[PDB]
Design a protein around this nucleic acid. Structure first.
Ligand SMILES: [Zn+2]
Lengths: 95, 115, 53, 15, 195, 1109
DNA sequence: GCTTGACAAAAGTGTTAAATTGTGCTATACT
C-alpha cells in the first residue's frame, strides 16, 4: 500500500471475471428461514464468500486461530478472519 | 408462523421523509469491535503470561496445559498425565493448589478488573 | 438510533500467526481441463471429488 | 428557496 | 465521429469482445449485507433482490435447453435474461425500471456511484470524525492570541485515552479498564492528570 | 376591565371603542360549528341565518341518501348526537388516553320494492373532542391543529405580456377545487380560445353552441367585442349537436363519437354534483365576482347556464377596456385583474373544516363497501348494522390526528408560546406549498395583511412568511375569509357602528388611521387625513372622503408583537427577532411582572388558559398548595385541582400556585391561581434588572453580557427542568427480559438506591451513569475464551445466563427523581404488542444561570453571558446599589433598536415614583398626560401601549421629576444618566453613564443542552463512520469547505489523518487507539473503506480497474 | 512427593421416533 502512481481502467473479457471469482452462485436462496445460517451454493454462501464469524467453518469441525488457512473437508469454507466477506466476489455463468 | 410470514424491509428506504439518509445511515452495529476492550484483552494475556511465570515450572505448566493457553485444547487430566506418567489425582491436586495460590489477593488483586 | 447485528460473532484473538497447524495440499482436475489446489488438513481421507471455483 | 433546476437555469447563456 | 470509437480499440489493451458477457460477477455479500434488526425484523439491500432475479431466469433457461423447448419459449427466456441483466447493471436505462414493493425503483449497481449518493460523490460532501466536539463561545479578553479556553468536561472527553495512559502510568489505576472507569466516573484524580 | 386587574396606569391618550375579542375564538368557534352546538346555533340564527346546518350534519346530508345500482334500496343518515366524554382531561393525560366522546347518528333504511323501513342508532365511535383551551388530548399529549391558508376556489382573471413579440394576453381559469378545469384564454391572433380540461385550445363559440346557443343569438348578444366576432367567423360548427360531437371527438378520439354520449359527458363533466363541485365557497366567490344571482341564497354546487356566458363576456370586456359591466338577472360589478396574493381570494381552513375533510374521506371509504354489502346480501334480512362498517372512518380520523402536518405538538415552553401557536396561520401542508418553492413571491408582505395578519412577527427559519399569526382584532368569516373591524364614518363624524369587513369589501372604501385627531363630538378637527386607497397605497385625502376608521392603533400587530413596549421606535428586523424570542422564555422559579409593559400582559395571560379563574362569584372556602375550594352565592361548591410540578412538552416545569386566601370575595372571571409565567394574572416572562449601558474591560465585547453574582445567589434567573426516561421490558425469542434489582457483574454499591423491585427510589439523587431501573436479557451462547475461563475459575464466579441492560442516566444529565410511572400487562394495561412492562422516571433539576446561557430583552437585543462578576466588582451607584447587568454601548445604535433605551429610562422612572409640579399649573410637556398619571409612588407599574405609548418628550420630562431615595438624593439626573463608582479600583468613572431598569428574559438555548464531545463511541452499520444527530456521542461534520481550507494551508498530513484514521478506517483506528493508550507513536494511516468499497463496486460492473506503480 | 479403589455427574452409543422438506400428480371445459 501507499505505493501507487496511477490507476487504470479497462474492459473485462470474462477471463478476469472467472479469475476474480471464488465460486459461482448456483442457487438463488440467501439464508435459511427458521435458522439464520447462510445457504450453501447460493448467495451469502460461506464456501464461496468465506465464513460469517471469526475463525470458524460452517459445521465447526475446524475453528479458531490454530487452524488458520485450512479448508474444512466437509464444508469447503476456509477458516479466516471473517472480514474477508467484503473482499471475495462470485460469478454467474449465463446459459 | 406469524413472525415467519414477515417480509424484510429494504435497506435502501428513504427514512427521514427524503433522500438525505436512506435507511442505514443511522444503524449501529451491536457486534462492533470496541477498541478499549480489544486492547485490554491484549494486556490481559500478557498479565497472565507474567503471573503464571511466578509459579513453579510444573505448577505453571499444568495450568497452561489444562486451560490450553498455548494450543487452546482443554486437555483432560489423563492427557496431562503423559507429562510424567502421572495419575489424574496428583494433577488435580496440583491444579487446586495453584488455584489457591492464584485466587489470593496478592495475585488476584492485579487481575481483579477484567471480570 | 436503530441497532442491528449479523450472525458473524466476533473474536478478539490476536494470533495472526501465533499458532501454526500442519496441512496437506490436494490437487483436482476439472472436466474442462482446468486444475485447482486445496490445502486440506492432515485428517482422515482426501475427498475424491471437489466443487471447484 | 431555490432548487437545482432554477440554480442551473440561473447561469444559462440567455442570448 | 466513428473514427474515435473505432480507434479506441485499435492500439489499446482491450478487444471488442468485452461488450458481450459470458458471466457476470457478484459483489461480496457484506457490501450488500442483510442486517438483523433488534426484534426479529430483517433489513436487506435491494441489490440483493436483483442478482436473485437473474439466477431465477438463468437457471430456468438452463432447463429449457435441456428438454428441447420450442423456439418461442427459449427466445422469451433469453429476452427475460437480457432484461434482468440490464436491470442489474442499469435500472431504468432500457424500458421502465422494476419497482418491487411500494412505488419506487430498485437502485442497481450503476444507480450507485452515479447519483447524489454513492462514491464519486458524498465524499466531497463531508463525513463525520472522532476526537471532535462542538460548543457555544464566549469572549475571553484575558487570553493571549495563541490561547483558547476549553471547558473541563469537553477537554476530558477529547483527551480520555491520553488521560487513561497517564493515570495508569502514575499508579492511580492498575490497568486500562480501571482508568476508563475512573474517567467515566470523573474521580478527583482525573483533573490533575488532565491539566 | 377584569375583576382582579392589578393597578397599572396607562399612558394611552386614545379611547378604545371595541374590547379585544376572545383570543382563542378561532380554535373554538370552528369546532362548535363542526359539532353543531346549541350556542353555535343561537349565534348563527341571531346573525341572520335561517335553518343553519353544522359541519357533521352538512357532511351527512351530502352523503345521504345513497341508493343501490338496482334502485330498490336506500340508506340515509340524520340527527347526529353526542354523548358525555369517557373520562376527564387529567385522567386521559395521566393514563395516555384520548379525550373523546361517543358519537351517534340515526340511520334509516328503505326498501323501495316493498316499503320496509328500518330506523336505528349506529355507534360511529369515539370522536376526539377538545378542551376549553383549544387543544386535543391525543394519547396523553396536547396537540394543536393550526389553521391552514389555501387559495379559495373560484374564477380568477389574469393578464401577462408575451416575451416573444410583445403584446399582452388575458386568461381566466376557474378553480373548483373538487373537479376538472375550465378556462378561457386570448391569443395574439385577435381570438378567444377555450381549453376544456387543459387539453387543447378550442373556439369559444363551440362551447357556446354545445350549451345550446345558435349563430343568431350569439351575433345578437355578443355584439360588443370584435375579437369574439372574429372567433365566430373562424368557427366551422353549424349546429349545436355538431359542437357536442366535435367536443367529444376532440376530448377522447378513441371512443366512438355519438351525440347522446357527447352531451352526457359534457353534462357529467361539470353539471353534476357527484363529479364537479365548488365546495359552497366557489359559488359564493363567483356570485360576488360576476354578480349573478345576487340576494337570494344559493345551494347549487355547479356552474349555472349564465355563469359561463357571463365569464366569457367579462373576459371580453376586460380585453375591451370597460371598467363596468352588468347582465340581466344580476347587479352591476366592476372590472379588474385579480391576483393570487390577495385575501379576497385566499381563505382559511380552520380545525373544523380540516376535520370535516377527513370525515368526508372516511365516510366515502365506508360507503364504497356499504353499497357492496347491499349488493351482496339478501333482502328482508338486512339491518343498518349489517351494512355499516365504522372501521374506516375511525381509522381515517385517528390517522389525521397522529400523522397530519397540520396537527402537531403544542409548544408548551411558556403560556405565550402556546397562545401564539393556537392562533397560527400556516401556508403549507396537504394541498399547500412546498418548503423549497415559492421564493420571494408568496412570503412577501402584501398590503392586505393590515388588520388580518401580523406583518412583523413570523418565524425566521425555513418557514419565513409562509407562517404568520392572526391580528388582535380579527375573526374568520363563516365562509373562511379573515375579516377585520372598522369604525363607520358618515359626514366626517366617527360613530359607534363597528362593522367587520373583508379585504375585497375594504378595497371599495377609504379607511383612515386610528390616531387621527377628532373633535369632542366626533367630527374631524383637521382637513387632510392620511388614509389607505384601493391599491394598498397611503395618501392624504379630504376629511369628507373618509369612509371608515381603524378601531385602535394596534390593529395590525399580533399578540406576541403587542407585548413589546416602544415598538414604533424599533426596526422591523429587530422587532421580528424580539417577537420570535419572546416565545422561547423558560419559566423561572419565581416570576415577576414587568415594570414597563403594554396592556396585553393581562389578556394574554387569561386567554392562554395557564391560570385558574373562578367560574362564578363566591367566597374562598379554603386554599392549599394542591387545590382551591370556593363556595358560590347559590351554595354550590367548586373545587379546582392545581397541577403542581407538571412537565411541559418541551421539558420546562409547569405549575400553579394560589394567589388567594380564605374568606376572600372573588368575582366571576377573577384569577385565583397563576401559572408558570404569570404574576397576579399578568404575564411575567422575565425579570427587571438594573442595567448600565457601558463597555466594561471587553467582557461584553461582541454582544456579550456581564451579570452580577447576586442573580445566582438569590435565584433571580433560576429555572426547573424535568426530563422523562422510559424503558420497556418485552418478550423475546430467547425469553422474556425482566426488570430486577439483581444485576450481574456489578458491585452492590452502585445499586444501593434501587428499591425492592429494581427501580430507583423516589427522591434519590442521580448523576450520569447511574442505574434508574434494573433490566436483564437472555444472552444464549457463551463460548468463553480460555483467558476468561481461567480468570473466572480463579475468581470462582460462575457464568450467568443473563446480560445487564439497565437504563442509565444519559451523560451530562443530573437531578432528583420526582416521579415514577409503571405499566404492566399483568394489570391489564394497554401496552403495545409483545411489551410486558413499561417504566417512566422523571428527573428534575434546578438550573441556575451560568456562562454561555443566552439572555435577551424584548427588542431583539440578545447575547450569551460572558462573565458573572462578584457583587463587589460590579459598578455601583453612589448610594451603594450595584448594577445587575451591563450592556455594551456599541451594539445599540448599529442594530437600530433604540426602543431598549426608552424602556430603560421608563423603567427607572417607574421604579422610583415621580411627582410633576402641577401645583402651579400643568407644564407644557405634561399637558397631554392623563389626570391619573401626574404622580405615582415607588415600584409602580405603567403601561405604554404599542403605537399609543409615552412620547419621548413626556418621558424626558418625567426623568427630571423622579423622587429621591432613602438618603434624600436623586441618583439619575435629567439626562437619564448617573455616576458609577468602579468596583475594582474605586475611582468614579470619568463621565456619567445611562442607568435604568430593563426587563430581560432567559431563553431556552442553554449551554447544558449544547455541549458535545467524542473520543470513541458508536459507529454506523453501513458506512462505518461515526454516527451523529444526538448529544450523547454524536460526531462533527467535516465538510468539503474545511477540506479546501486544509488544502490551502498545505496541511497534507492533517487532512489524511482526519479523513481516514478518524472515520471509516476500521483497521487503523484500533491501532491508533492502542498506540495512544500504550504511549507508542501513531502508525501511518492505511487505505480508507471508502476506497476499497469503491474499488470492489467498480470491479463488480465488469470494469477491470487495477493499480500499478 | 505421589498412587489405588470407591463413587459420581457428564459426555457419548446406538438406534428409533417425530418433525421437516422435496416431489410427482389432479382428466367437464376454460385459450
Ligand atoms: Zn466444517
Amino acid at each position: 500500500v501507499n505505493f501507487f502512481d496511477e490507476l487504470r481502467i479497462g474492459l473485462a473479457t470474462a477471463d478476469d471475471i472467472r479469475n476474480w471469482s471464488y465460486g459461482e452462485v448456483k442457487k438463488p436462496e440467501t439464508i435459511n428461514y427458521r435458522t439464520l445460517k447462510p445457504e450453501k451454493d447460493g448467495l451469502f454462501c460461506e464456501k464461496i464468500f468465506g465464513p460469517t464469524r471469526d475463525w470458524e467453518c460452517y459445521c465447526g469441525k475446524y475453528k479458531r486461530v490454530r487452524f488458520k488457512g485450512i479448508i474444512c473437508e466437509r464444508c469447503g469454507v476456509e477458516v479466516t478472519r471473517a472480514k474477508v466477506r467484503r473482499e471475495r466476489m462470485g460469478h454467474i455463468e449465463l446459459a | 408462523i406469524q413472525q415467519y410470514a414477515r417480509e424484510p424491509i429494504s435497506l435502501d428506504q428513504t427514512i427521514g421523509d427524503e433522500g438525505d439518509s436512506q435507511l442505514g445511515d443511522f444503524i449501529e452495529d451491536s457486534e462492533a469491535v470496541v477498541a478499549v476492550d480489544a486492547v485490554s484483552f491484549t494486556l490481559l494475556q500478557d498479565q497472565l503470561q507474567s503471573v503464571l511465570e511466578t509459579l513453579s515450572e510444573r505448577e505453571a505448566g499444568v495450568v497452561r496445559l489444562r486451560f490450553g493457553l498455548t494450543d487452546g485444547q482443554p486437555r483432560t487430566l489423563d492427557e496431562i498425565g503423559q507429562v510424567y506418567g502421572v495419575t489424574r489425582e496428583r494433577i488435580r491436586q496440583i491444579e487446586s493448589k495453584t488455584m489457591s495460590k492464584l485466587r489470593h489477593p496478592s495475585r488476584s488483586q492485579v487481575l481483579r478488573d477484567y471480570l | 438510533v436503530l441497532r442491528g447485528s449479523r450472525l458473524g460473532a466476533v473474536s478478539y484473538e490476536t494470533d495472526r500467526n501465533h499458532d501454526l497447524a500442519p496441512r496437506q495440499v490436494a490437487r483436482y482436475r476439472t472436466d474442462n481441463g482446468e486444475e485447482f489446489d486445496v490445502p486440506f488438513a492432515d485428517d482422515a481421507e482426501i475427498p475424491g471429488t471437489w466443487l471447484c471455483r | 428557496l431555490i432548487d437545482a433546476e432554477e440554480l442551473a437555469d440561473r447561469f444559462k447563456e440567455q442570448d | 465521429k466513428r473514427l474515435k470509437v473505432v480507434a479506441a480499440f485499435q492500439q489499446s489493451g482491450n478487444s471488442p469482445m468485452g461488450m458481450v458477457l459470458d458471466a457476470v460477477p457478484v459483489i461480496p455479500p457484506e457490501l450488500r449485507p442483510m442486517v438483523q434488526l433488534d426484534g426479529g425484523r430483517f433489513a436487506t439491500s435491494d441489490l440483493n433482490d436483483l442478482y436473485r432475479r437473474v439466477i431465477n431466469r438463468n437457471n430456468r433457461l438452463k432447463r429449457l435447453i435441456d428438454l428441447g423447448a420450442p423456439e418461442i419459449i427459449v427466445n422469451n427466456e433469453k429476452r427475460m435474461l437480457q432484461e434482468s441483466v440490464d436491470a442489474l447493471f442499469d435500472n431504468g436505462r432500457r424500458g421502465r425500471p422494476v419497482t418491487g414493493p411500494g412505488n419506487r425503483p430498485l437502485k442497481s449497481l450503476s444507480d450507485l456511484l452515479k447519483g447524489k449518493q454513492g462514491r464519486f460523490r458524498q465524499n466531497l460532501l463531508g463525513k463525520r470524525v472522532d476526537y471532535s466536539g462542538r460548543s457555544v463561545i464566549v469572549v475571553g479578553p484575558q487570553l493571549k492570541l495563541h490561547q483558547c479556553g476549553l471547558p473541563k468536561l469537553m477537554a476530558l472527553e477529547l483527551f480520555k485515552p491520553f488521560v487513561m495512559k497517564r493515570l495508569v502510568d502514575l499508579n492511580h489505576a492498575q490497568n486500562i479498564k480501571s482508568a476508563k472507569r475512573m474517567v467515566e466516573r470523573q474521580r478527583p484524580q482525573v483533573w490533575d492528570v488532565l491539566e | 376591565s377584569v375583576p382582579g386587574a392589578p393597578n397599572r396606569v396607562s399612558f394611552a391618550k386614545l379611547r378604545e371603542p371595541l374590547e379585544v375579542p376572545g383570543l382563542l375564538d378561532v380554535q373554538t368557534d370552528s369546532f362548535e360549528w363542526l359539532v353543531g352546538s346549541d350556542r353555535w346555533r343561537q349565534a348563527a340564527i341571531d346573525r341572520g341565518e335561517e335553518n343553519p346546518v353544522g359541519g357533521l350534519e352538512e357532511v351527512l346530508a351530502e352523503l345521504s341518501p345513497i341508493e343501490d345500482f338496482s334502485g330498490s334500496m336506500s340508506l340515509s343518515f340524520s340527527d347526529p348526537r353526542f354523548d358525555e366524554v369517557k373520562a376527564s382531561v387529567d385522567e386521559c393525560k395521566d393514563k395516555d388516553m384520548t379525550y373523546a366522546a361517543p358519537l351517534f347518528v340515526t340511520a334509516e333504511f328503505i326498501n323501495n320494492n316493498t316499503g320496509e323501513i328500518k330506523s336505528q342508532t349506529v355507534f360511529m365511535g369515539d370522536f376526539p373532542m377538545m378542551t376549553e383551551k383549544g387543544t386535543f388530548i391525543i394519547n396523553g399529549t396536547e396537540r394543536v391543529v393550526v389553521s391552514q391558508l389555501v387559495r379559495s376556489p373560484g374564477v380568477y382573471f389574469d393578464e401577462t405580456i408575451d416575451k416573444s413579440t410583445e403584446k399582452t394576453l388575458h386568461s381566466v381559469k376557474v378553480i373548483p377545487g373538487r373537479g376538472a378545469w375550465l378556462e378561457f384564454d386570448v391569443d395574439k391572433r385577435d381570438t378567444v380560445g377555450v381549453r376544456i380540461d387543459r387539453k387543447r385550445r378550442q373556439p369559444v363559440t363551440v362551447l357556446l353552441k354545445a350549451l345550446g346557443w345558435t349563430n343568431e343569438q350569439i351575433v345578437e348578444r355578443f355584439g360588443f367585442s370584435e375579437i369574439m366576432m372574429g372567433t365566430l367567423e373562424k368557427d366551422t360548427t353549424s349546429g349545436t349537436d355538431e359542437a357536442l360531437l366535435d367536443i367529444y371527438r376532440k376530448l377522447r378520439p378513441g371512443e366512438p363519437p355519438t351525440k347522446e354520449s357527447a352531451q352526457t359527458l359534457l353534462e357529467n363533466l361539470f353539471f353534476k354534483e357527484k363529479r364537479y363541485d365548488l365546495a359552497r365557497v366557489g359559488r359564493y366567490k363567483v356570485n360576488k365576482k360576476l354578480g349573478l344571482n345576487a340576494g337570494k341564497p344559493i345551494t347549487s354546487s355547479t356552474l349555472t347556464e349564465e355563469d359561463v356566458v357571463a365569464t366569457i363576456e367579462y373576459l371580453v370586456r376586460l380585453h375591451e377596456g370597460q371598467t363596468s359591466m352588468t347582465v340581466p338577472g344580476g347587479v352591476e360589478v366592476p372590472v379588474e385583474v385579480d391576483d393570487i396574493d390577495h385575501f379576497g381570494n385566499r381563505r382559511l381552513r380552520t380545525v373544523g373544516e380540516l376535520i370535516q375533510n377527513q370525515i368526508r374521506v372516511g365516510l366515502s371509504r365506508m360507503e364504497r363497501v356499504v353499497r357492496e354489502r347491499m349488493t351482496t346480501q339478501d333482502v328482508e334480512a338486512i339491518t343498518p348494522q349489517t351494512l355499516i362498517n365504522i372501521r374506516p372512518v375511525v381509522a381515517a380520523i385517528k390517522e389525521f390526528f397522529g400523522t397530519s402536518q397540520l396537527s402537531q405538538f403544542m409548544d408548551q415552553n411558556n403560556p405565550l408560546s402556546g397562545l401564539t401557536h393556537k392562533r397560527r396561520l400556516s401556508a403549507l401542508g396537504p394541498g399547500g406549498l412546498s418548503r423549497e418553492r415559492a421564493g420571494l413571491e408568496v412570503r412577501d408582505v402584501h398590503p392586505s395583511h393590515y388588520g388580518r395578519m401580523c406583518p412583523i412577527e413570523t418565524p425566521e427559519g425555513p418557514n419565513i412568511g409562509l407562517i404568520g399569526s392572526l391580528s388582535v382584532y380579527a375573526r374568520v368569516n363563516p365562509f373562511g375569509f379573515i375579516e377585520t373591524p372598522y369604525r363607520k364614518v358618515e359626514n366626517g363624524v366617527v360613530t359607534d357602528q363597528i362593522d367587520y369587513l373583508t379585504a375585497d369589501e375594504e378595497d371599495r372604501h377609504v379607511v383612515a388611521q386610528a390616531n387621527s385627531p377628532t373633535d369632542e363630538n366626533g367630527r374631524f378637527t383637521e382637513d387632510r387625513v392620511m388614509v389607505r386607497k384601493k391599491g394598498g397605497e397611503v395618501e392624504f385625502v379630504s376629511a369628507d372622503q373618509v369612509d371608515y376608521m381603524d378601531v385602535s392603533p394596534r390593529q395590525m400587530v399580533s399578540v406576541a408583537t403587542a407585548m413589546i413596549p416602544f415598538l414604533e421606535h424599533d426596526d422591523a428586523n429587530r422587532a421580528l427577532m424580539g417577537a420570535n424570542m419572546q416565545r422561547q422564555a423558560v419559566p423561572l422559579v419565581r416570576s415577576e411582572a414587568p415594570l414597563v409593559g403594554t396592556g396585553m400582559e393581562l389578556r394574554a395571560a387569561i386567554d392562554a388558559g395557564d391560570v385558574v379563574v373562578a367560574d362564578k362569584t363566591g367566597v374562598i372556602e379554603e386554599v392549599s398548595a394542591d387545590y382551591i375550594t370556593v363556595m358560590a352565592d347559590d351554595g354550590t361548591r367548586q373545587s379546582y385541582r392545581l397541577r403542581k410540578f407538571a412537565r411541559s412538552n418541551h421539558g420546562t416545569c409547569a405549575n400553579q400556585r394560589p394567589i388567594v386566601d380564605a374568606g376572600q370575595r372573588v368575582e366571576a372571571g377573577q384569577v385565583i391561581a397563576d401559572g408558570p409565567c404569570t404574576q397576579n394574572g399578568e404575564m411575567a416572562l422575565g425579570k427587571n434588572l438594573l442595567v448600565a449601558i457601558m463597555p466594561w474591560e471587553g467582557h461584553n465585547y461582541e454582544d456579550a453580557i456581564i451579570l452580577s453574582n447576586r442573580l445566582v445567589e438569590e435565584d433571580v434567573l433560576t429555572s426547573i427542568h424535568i426530563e422523562e426516561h422510559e424503558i420497556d421490558a418485552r418478550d423475546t425469542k430467547l425469553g422474556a427480559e425482566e426488570i430486577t434489582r439483581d444485576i450481574p457483574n456489578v458491585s452492590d454499591e452502585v445499586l444501593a438506591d434501587l428499591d425492592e423491585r429494581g427501580i430507583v427510589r423516589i427522591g434519590a439523587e442521580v448523576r450520569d451513569g447511574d442505574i434508574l431501573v434494573g433490566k436483564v436479557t437472555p444472552k444464549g451462547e457463551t463460548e468463553l475464551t480460555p483467558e476468561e475461563r481461567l480468570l473466572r475459575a480463579i475468581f470462582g464466579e460462575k457464568a450467568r445466563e443473563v446480560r445487564d441492560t439497565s437504563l442509565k442516566v444519559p451523560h451530562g444529565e443530573s437531578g432528583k427523581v420526582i416521579g415514577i410511572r409503571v405499566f404492566s400487562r399483568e394489570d391489564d394495561d394497554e401496552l403495545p404488542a409483545g411489551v410486558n412492562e413499561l417504566v417512566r422516571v422523571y428527573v428534575a433539576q434546578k438550573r441556575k444561570i451560568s456562562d454561555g446561557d443566552k439572555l435577551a430583552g424584548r427588542h431583539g437585543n440578545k447575547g450569551v453571558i460572558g462573565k458573572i462578576l462578584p457583587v463587589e466588582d460590579m459598578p455601583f451607584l453612589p448610594d451603594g446599589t450595584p448594577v445587575d447587568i451591563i450592556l455594551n454601548t456599541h451594539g445599540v445604535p448599529r442594530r437600530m433598536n433604540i426602543g431598549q433605551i426608552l424602556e430603560t429610562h421608563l423603567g427607572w422612572v417607574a421604579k422610583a415614583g415621580w411627582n410633576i409640579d402641577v401645583a402651579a399649573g400643568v407644564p407644557d410637556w405634561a399637558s397631554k398626560l392623563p389626570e391619573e398619571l401626574y404622580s405615582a409612588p415607588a415600584d409602580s407599574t405603567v403601561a405604554t401601549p404599542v403605537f399609543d405609548g409615552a412620547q419621548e418628550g413626556e418621558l424626558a420630562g418625567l426623568l427630571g421629576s423622579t423622587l429621591p431615595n432613602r438618603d434624600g438624593e436623586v441618583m439619575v439626573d435629567a439626562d437619564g444618566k448617573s455616576t458609577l463608582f468602579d468596583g475594582r479600583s474605586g475611582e468614579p468613572f470619568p463621565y456619567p453613564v445611562t442607568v435604568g431598569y430593563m426587563y430581560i428574559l432567559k431563553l431556552h438555548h442553554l449551554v447544558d443542552d449544547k455541549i458535545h464531545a467524542r473520543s470513541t463511541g458508536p459507529y454506523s452499520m453501513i458506512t462505518q463512520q461515526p454516527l451523529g444527530g444526538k448529544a450523547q456521542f454524536g460526531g462533527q461534520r467535516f465538510g468539503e469547505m474545511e477540506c479546501w481550507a486544509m488544502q490551502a494551508y498545505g496541511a497534507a498530513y492533517t487532512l489524511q489523518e482526519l479523513l481516514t484514521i478518524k472515520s471509516d478506517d476500521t483497521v487503523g483506528r484500533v491501532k491508533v487507539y492502542e498506540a495512544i493508550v500504550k504511549g507508542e507513536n501513531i502508525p501511518e494511516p492505511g487505505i480508507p473503506e471508502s476506497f476499497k468499497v469503491l474499488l470492489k463496486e467498480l470491479q463488480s460492473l465488469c470494469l477491470n480497474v487495477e493499480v500499478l506503480s
